[PDB]
Structures are given as structure tokens and as C-alpha cells.
Design a protein around this ligand. Sequence first.
Ligand SMILES: *[C@@H]1O[C@H](CO)[C@@H](O)[C@H](O)[C@H]1NC(C)=O
Ligand SMILES: *[C@@H]1O[C@H](CO)[C@@H](O)[C@H](O)[C@H]1NC(C)=O
Ligand SMILES: *[C@@H]1O[C@H](CO)[C@@H](O)[C@H](O)[C@H]1NC(C)=O
Lengths: 289, 276, 9, 100
Amino acid sequence: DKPFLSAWPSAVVPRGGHVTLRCHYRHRFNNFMLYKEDRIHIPIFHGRIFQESFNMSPVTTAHAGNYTCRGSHPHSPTGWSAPSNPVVIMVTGNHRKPSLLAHPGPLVKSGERVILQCWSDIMFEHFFLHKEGISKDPSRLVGQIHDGVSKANFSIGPMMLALAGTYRCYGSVTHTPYQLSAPSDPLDIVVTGPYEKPSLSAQPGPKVQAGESVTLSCSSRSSYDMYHLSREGGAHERRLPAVRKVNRTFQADFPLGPATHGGTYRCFGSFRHSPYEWSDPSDPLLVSV
Amino acid sequence: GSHSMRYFYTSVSRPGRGEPRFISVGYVDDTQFVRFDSDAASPREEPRAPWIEQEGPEYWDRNTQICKTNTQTYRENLRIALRYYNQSEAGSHTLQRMYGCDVGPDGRLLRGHNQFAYDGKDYIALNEDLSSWTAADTAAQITQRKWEAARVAEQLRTYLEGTCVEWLRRYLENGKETLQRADPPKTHVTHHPISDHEATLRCWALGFYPAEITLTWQRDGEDQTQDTELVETRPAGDRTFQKWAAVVVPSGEEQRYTCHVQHEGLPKPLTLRWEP
Amino acid sequence: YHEDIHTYL
Amino acid sequence: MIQRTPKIQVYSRHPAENGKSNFLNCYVSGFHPSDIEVDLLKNGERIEKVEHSDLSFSKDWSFYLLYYTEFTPTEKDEYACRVNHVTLSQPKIVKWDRDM
Ligand SMILES: *[C@@H]1O[C@H](CO)[C@@H](O)[C@H](O)[C@H]1NC(C)=O
Ligand SMILES: *[C@@H]1O[C@H](CO)[C@@H](O)[C@H](O)[C@H]1NC(C)=O
Ligand SMILES: *[C@@H]1O[C@H](CO)[C@@H](O)[C@H](O)[C@H]1NC(C)=O
């Protein structure tokens, strides 16, 4: 029957990296022959029979391509399995990287969509969007060439944690199709929600005694590990660990001072080592002077 | 769906035994379709498969001109190599070039090739990125510097991605009924005593196209690669190919052995055995 | 179709 | 200076049958440099009007050529291919064995 062909840790792999192909068949990582592109009736490598795995290390440009395996099946009429699923090894690092931005931005409300736009002044014919992780397939879009720029809009959503995380984009040209560019700078997409929004307020109060110092306090009865304070129109996030200071409240007190800018702030809670999901945002708070 | 076009250039110096010779042959997959030989009476690019014969006069004119210019170029290259390697003007030497394109089922360039040998050893090759070179020795490092300055890789990339792929697509249509129709092997097993106690089982594959084939012997379902004699695939002379694979078997054990064949013309891998 | 180049060592 | 001695296969285009017209092939491969002398023989004597392919070569740069002629196999007649090359002190002769 049909083996399962897999690339480990990733079919999208840098030149100079490492990737291992395995052909799981008859409940074992079996012996196998490999096939390229459409030519499933004639093996590559002069019919070399691989034992357990094929290790490409260091990965080279020559390793890129579209592979299928057949598993060894002795004492059967043909001696081999049916063709496996195809695996496309894409080797990265062969062109200058594209740029990658999130529109309207990288903080995405649960249930909403975000555009991840890849673009380049290199006329890439195709773009590939890849979420960081093991065994992840990239999504592909044709490049729209216009005004000396090639670009593609990847649509992500409705947003939830499975779609949050670090993304990179790659370009490819038609003359070397499985040879991808260097990866774009990484872009972190953070989902906000469904965890309940914290409160954001001036503490200990708006009227302050002589020995009292005003802070911007993010607080919740929920057991957040960290809080994130964001100014509207500001790309900088301030982060503080949540502390059990009073009552049953989890809070962080961000100092106000001559160095803090006025404007509109929101804060978010998050949990340790889950950096790509935050709570719903607090109601915005105007900070004066 | 996947196909290749390749040119093979050979240039040979032969002081006192002939003029420096330039030969070019072109192939689509395993089928030769053109030749040029500077030793011919009035050298021109000549057809070698019928499906190229209806290309118009401009095709033959321009490819002949490229080959005539190549004849002069490679005569000079042989002189340059003498200087690089400090060799005598009385000796005979060989320069070879192979280049061309592989296309996938989508008609897009899958791989390009452009590499050179001097006196039978690697000299310089274009890497698979189609933008950098691998030089084999210090002489080829000089050539690499000159070809970088001349932007040779960029020109080759343009040729490979354009002209090469476009004309390969045209040839495949011109000769579709031979180039794109796989002719499966006709297969059989023969038996020949080597002594009073052992015999050769020979598995034959005859009349197949293209030339790529796998032919192996198993004993009790186990591969016998280490004990199998495999001859080089050989041309039958009619644009098909032949191969055989042989194993030496003890008399009385012939039924343990099975021959295994894979070829683009066989929709499933094939198993066969000796039958008296 | 040949490449229209005359490359010298 | 790489020198590689020719590999030689002598064989018929179709399975041989005594008295039936066929083609006798001598495939010479794996050699370097390219200068080579190839003849087809009948009872040791050179056959005239043999044809051959145009010089080409393999991925490892070694050359190959096919020489061939129309012939009719018989019980009595012995066919062979004769090859001379710079690597050979005297010509190499390989007899046609219809089993190979
Ligand atoms: C890979 O090849 C398979 C057939 O072997 C084909 O169905 C598939 O479309 C190819 N995939 C890509 C991404 O080219
Ligand atoms: C692509 O995304 C950009 C975001 O910067 C947007 O301006 C543009 O309208 C999008 N194009 C399409 C076709 O949606
Ligand atoms: C602590 O809890 C009491 C009772 O719920 C409440 O009155 C008081 O305001 C709380 N203190 C703060 C600082 O929120």
C-alpha cells in the first residue's frame, strides 16, 4: 500500500542545514527507494535502496526537489509498495530575503484576520509563508509584480493560538523553483483573547498623599504571570511580572515619570512560556503629562 | 514529464596527426539529434534524428555559425591550457564541455548544467545555484576570475532559463511520439552452465527507451547486489537500449531467484523468474 | 539550440 | 594525464537466429583520450562498410561510441570486435557470444 514519507525536522531547510527523509511502511521505518517529481516508475540514485533513512547533511542546493518513496515489500507481486505521499524539500538561503509585515499589526484579536504581507524589490515569482516549528508546511502565493516591487498578501485567521507564533517569508524565482531566498526577518503574531481583560488604572489613586507615588497598575483576579503595557501609537511594550501585592489581585505597577509619555495605554496579561497569547486588552486609559 | 537537453563538446589537439578537432553532439534525453564535426568536409550542424529535420534554414544557419565560432574558440582554449599547465606544444590534449537543462513536468527549469574537463579531469563547473563556480585547481581559478569578470554565470542562467527550456519544449513536441512515449523493456531469463554444479541466470531487458532502468536479482526476496554482474546499459542501434543482469546460482536452486525491473514504460515494478 | 557564447579559458 | 582503457561489449541488435538478418554491435565506452580504432571482424577479417555513432561522453568524461554492421549469424562464422587505443599495447579482440 502507501508509505508515509516524512522530512525531519522540516522540509523547509537552510542550505548547510540538515534534513532526514524516512519512509514509514508496514509499521516500520522501512527500506525504500526514492523517486523525483513525476517519475514514479523509475527510481533516482540508480535504484539505491535506503536503509531506514536518507540523511542530507549538510543540505545543499542539489537536495531541493519533489520526492516520493516506495517501501520494500518482499514476496509481493511487484516487490514494492505503491508511491508514498510526496515531500517537497525546499532549500533556503539562495537569494536576498524579502520583507514581512503584519497589517494592521501583529497583535490580532481572537477570531479576527490579519494580513501578513511579504514584499521585495527582487521580482520573486512566488512567496512562501512559513510558521516556525517542526513539520510545518509553508503556504504559497504568486508574487504580484507592480511598480518595481513583488508582493503577496497572506491571510491568517480567524485568529486563535494555533495560528499565533513566529512567521518567516521566503521568495522564489521560476528559474530555481525549490531554491528559496534567505528567510525574512521573523515576525511574531500574538493573539489577544480569550482570557479576561485586566483593569488598567492610576494607583494607589488619582489623588496622592505626600508619601504616595503614582503608577500605572495592571490588575486582575486571574492568575496572569506577566503584564504587558502598550501605548497607542507606540511600538514599545513594557513588561513586568505579575505580583500578589494586595488582596487576591495579581498586578504589576508600571512607573510614571518625566520619561514616560502621555497618551492612551492598554495592558494585557499573559502566562509564562506561552508568549504568543495575551489576554483581551484592558479598556484604554488616558495618561496625562 | 521530466526531460533533459544536453550538449557535449569535445576539442582535441593532435600535433602532426591532424588539425585541432571540435565535435559537438546534442541530446534530448537519450536521443542524439544533432552533430557538428570540424573534421567533416564542409562542416555544418547536421540532423541526427528525423524530428529535427523540419527546422528551417535559419535554425541550421545559426547553430552552424555557433559551432564554427566554437571551433576557433576551443582551438584557442587548448593553447591557453598549455600555458596554464606549462605543457609542451608537441603533446595531445583534450578539452570537454557538457551543458544543458533539466525540465520538470511543469515545463520549468529544474536544474542547469555547465561544466568542463581538461585531459579527462574536472576543470570548472557551474554550481546548482547557477551563480557561482567550482574550480578544481589553480589553473581553473584563473578561468573563474575571468568568467566572473565577464559575467558568464549570468549569461548562462539567461540561456538555461530561456532558450534552453524553450527549445527543449519545442523538441519534445516535434518528437513527441518517440521522445515522450516510453518503450517498455521486453524481458526474459536465460540459463548458462558455468560448471557441472553452477549456472548463470541472466535477466535480459531489450528494446527499451529511455535508457534509465533498474535490473536486480533477489534470492528468497533478499537483494543480491554484491553477487550480481550488471553490464552497462548499451544502445541497440535503433534508438532503443539493452541491459542484462546475471547471478551465479547452484544447480537445483534456480527457483530461489527472481529478477526485478523498473522502467518508465512499466506502470508497476516487474518480477520475473527462470522457466525451462 | 546551442548557447550563443564563445567562452575562453 | 588521465588514461582510461576501453570497455567493450559485442552483441546483436536482436536475439540471434542462424540465417536471419540482424545487426552486429560493438559498444566501446569508458575510455580516455578519444582517439580509438574500432573494427568488426568476421573470422578474424575486417568487415568493410561498418558504420558508427558520433563521439560523445558520459558524466565522468569518458568517451563512448557504437560501431555496427548488418550481418547474418551462422553456426560456422565467428564474429568479433577489435579495438586499439593508446592504453593497449596490441588491439583487444572481444568475440561475439550470442548468450551475452
Ligand atoms: C510533487 O510531485 C507529485 C507527483 O509525484 C505531484 O502530484 C505534486 O503536484 C508535486 N508537488 C509540487 C509542490 O510540485
Ligand atoms: C494587501 O495588503 C495591504 C496591506 O498593507 C493592503 O493595503 C492591500 O489592499 C492588500 N491587497 C489586497 C488585494 O487585499
Ligand atoms: C481589597 O479588598 C477589599 C474588599 O474586597 C476592598 O474594599 C479594597 O478596595 C481592596 N483593596 C484594593 C487595593 O483593591
